[PDB]
């Protein structure tokens, strides 16, 4: 099947910029070449097929071009409705095949998380299990490092992490981390801490609890 | 007014089976090719299958090739996908598509398709959430964990839907054991913890478990 490789992952716009996505073929797929928009929970829409030709009633605001294995979707002035995600298609050989997908977010001034760490609670130590929680709220952009820290020793492959949506008034991102470890190894420590790197902050910010002593 | 409305997604065993159905309206759907396409969590859209306008011509991707069937209702207007054999990979929001007017049925874009329909093949079983409280430690956060349920999704909401600004609920993960976990937070005025209460209504329905579980400073 042929690759398609979109580029960049993500980006961030403001209305009335000009946002510029390509798509790279694995072998050249001359013009035969769509362009789709995505939304959470919507319907994918085609914008743009054999590479520069735009579907009837799409905006003139769009453009497509390229040809061969090198390919260009242009926003020219980017409007509130196009923040979404856009990904391309080939159509030259049988399987067609679909990019990763390029997700458009808004732009706002950066912002700085605040940063929130909670303890396990007493009834989930109960259970023989511990999740510790740190909230980064309200940041801009997405990009964020959360590092778990257990007596200074640096923690790999115990957390997980999710991030909201874009809020629809502040344009900033939430996101959450949480650290599991047994009940047993959650009592053998002390000090347990998030350290939080971010555009936002001239110097990576640590929230810190004491397990006892407190 | 052309529409394509997917249906039959739930969640199943490896192994088991599930039929899709895609309704269509707003066109003549016995004159056009229709496909199946799916994408999976944090994936690309990956091409599954296409049937020719009078059903006889019928083509699958490798993957899914011997255990999955797309056939068609012309008199219904309906496409459909019979899946037997489900694998965890299996697992996507399944789209139908239809075939781009005059151009070849067997590598085409597509001008419309439909929301889709969550299909999720998983060997957990369905398991009410644990909630546990994040409490509150001028601006103060506190929130509910709710852990080690299963499937997707469930609802979290404050103070019965009274508080509504400053609440996040997060996208759930899915945590190694195949069950999932989520966490809901809100800040609120330090001063005004021990005059306002704060609970977490947390439902999921399909363990119809709903946990009221209310917040305190330690």
């Known amino acids: 099947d042929i690759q398609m490789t979109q580029s960049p992952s993500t980006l961030s716009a403001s209305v009335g910029d000009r946002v510029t996505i390509t798509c790279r073929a694995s072998?050249?797929?001359?013009?035969?070449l769509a362009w789709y928009q995505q939304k959470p929970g919507k319907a994918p829409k085609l914008l743009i097929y054999?590479?520069?030709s735009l579907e009837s009633g799409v905006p003139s605001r769009f453009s497509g071009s390229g040809s061969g294995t090198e390919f260009t979707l242009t926003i020219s002035s980017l409007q509130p409705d196009d923040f979404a995600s856009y990904c391309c298609?080939?159509?030259?050989?049988?399987?067609?095949?679909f990019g990763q997908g390029t997700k458009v977010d808004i732009k706002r001034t950066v912002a700085a998380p605040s940063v929130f760490i909670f303890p396990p609670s007493d009834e989930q130590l109960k259970s023989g299990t511990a999740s510790v929680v740190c909230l980064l709220n309200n940041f801009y952009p997405r990009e964020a490092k959360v590092q778990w820290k257990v007596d200074n020793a640096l923690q790999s492959g115990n957390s997980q992490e999710s991030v909201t949506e874009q809020d629809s008034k502040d344009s900033t991102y939430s996101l959450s981390s949480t650290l599991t470890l047994s009940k047993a190894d959650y009592e053998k420590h002390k000090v347990y801490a998030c350290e939080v790197t971010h555009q936002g902050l001239s110097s990576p910010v640590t929230k810190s609890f004491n397990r006892g002593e407190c | 007014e052309v529409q394509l409305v997917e249906s039959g997604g739930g969640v199943v065993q490896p192994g088991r089976s599930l039929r899709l159905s895609c309704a269509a309206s707003?066109?003549?759907?016995?004159?056009?090719?229709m496909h199946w396409v799916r994408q999976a969590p944090g994936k690309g859209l990956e091409w599954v299958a296409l049937?020719?306008?009078?059903?006889?011509?019928?083509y699958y991707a490798d993957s899914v090739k011997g255990r999955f069937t797309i056939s068609r209702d012309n008199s219904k207007n309906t496409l459909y996908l019979q899946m037997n054999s489900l694998r965890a990979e299996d697992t996507a929001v399944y789209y139908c598509?239809?075939?781009?007017?005059?151009?070849?049925?067997?590598?085409?874009?597509?001008?419309?398709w439909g929301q889709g329909t969550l299909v999720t093949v998983s060997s957990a079983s369905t398991k009410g959430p644990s909630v546990f409280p994040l409490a509150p430690s001028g601006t103060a956060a506190l929130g509910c964990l709710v852990k080690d349920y299963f499937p997707e999704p469930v609802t979290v909401s404050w103070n019965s839907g009274a508080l509504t600004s400053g609440v996040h609920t997060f996208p759930a993960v899915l945590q190694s054991s195949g069950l999932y976990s989520l966490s809901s937070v809100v800040t609120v005025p330090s001063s005004s913890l021990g005059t306002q209460t704060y609970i977490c209504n947390v439902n999921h329905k399909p363990s119809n478990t709903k946990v009221d579980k209310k917040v305190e400073p330690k």
């Open positions: 598509a239809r075939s781009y007017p005059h151009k070849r049925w067997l590598r085409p874009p597509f001008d419309y």
């Open positions: 707003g066109f003549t759907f016995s004159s056009y090719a």
């Open positions: 049937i020719s306008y009078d059903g006889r011509n019928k």
């Open positions: 072998q050249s797929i001359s013009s035969w």
């Open positions: 054999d590479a520069s």
């Open positions: 298609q080939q159509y030259n050989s049988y399987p067609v095949t």
